[PDB]
Design a protein around this ligand. Structure first.
Ligand SMILES: [Cl-]
Ligand SMILES: [Zn+2]
Ligand SMILES: [Zn+2]
Ligand SMILES: [Zn+2]
Ligand SMILES: [Zn+2]
Ligand SMILES: [Zn+2]
Lengths: 152, 22
């Protein structure tokens, strides 16, 4: 029983799937859902924005990582661990990693329209929740994300 | 290595976005 992991995977999977398919999921989010929905709304707003201005860089990275299929996620996990290896953790880095995950997911859908986004979403969620567990907990998890990116 | 370069790139963008929202 791991609610933070469950919640994180739901948020990230939903974002990746929407981005990949172009369609929103009309199914009530699990327990919580209030924070999750606001997190997903935040992720749409800021994640789309990251993808903007950085299309060239993202394409560059996709190409260099040569991600061949829905299951080829080991290299991305390594890259994410490497990003955090200077010892710095913040929501800008996290949203950028998730946004890049959505970028990859979109591209995998073009090559194969039957591609599952779950391996990618699981790989990203694993890095975030497992390696930043206490950092997330201290901050009431996704509330930290919501408030950091909150605009009036 | 492509993996080191990708990490450098994602970190640059990540910190930029962090600094943006403060
Ligand atoms: Cl690890
Ligand atoms: Zn593409
Ligand atoms: Zn799975
Ligand atoms: Zn709050
Ligand atoms: Zn390094
Ligand atoms: Zn660069």
């Amino acid at each position: 029983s791991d609610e933070l992991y469950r919640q994180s995977l739901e948020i990230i999977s939903r974002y990746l799937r929407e981005q990949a398919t172009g369609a929103k999921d009309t199914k009530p989010m699990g327990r919580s859902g209030a924070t999750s929905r606001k997190a997903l709304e935040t992720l749409r707003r800021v994640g789309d924005g990251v993808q903007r201005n950085h299309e060239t860089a993202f394409q560059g990275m996709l190409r260099k990582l040569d991600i061949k299929n829905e299951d080829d996620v080991k290299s991305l996990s390594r890259v994410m661990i490497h990003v955090f290896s200077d010892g710095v953790t913040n929501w800008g880095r996290i949203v950028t990693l998730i946004s890049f995950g959505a970028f990859v997911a979109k591209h995998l859908k073009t090559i194969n329209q039957e591609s599952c986004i779950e391996p990618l979403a699981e790989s990203i969620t694993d890095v975030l929740v497992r390696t930043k567990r206490d950092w997330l907990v201290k901050q009431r998890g996704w509330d930290g994300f919501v408030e950091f990116f909150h605009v009036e | 290595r492509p993996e080191i370069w990708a990490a450098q790139e994602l970190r640059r963008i990540g910190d930029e976005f962090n600094a943006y929202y403060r």
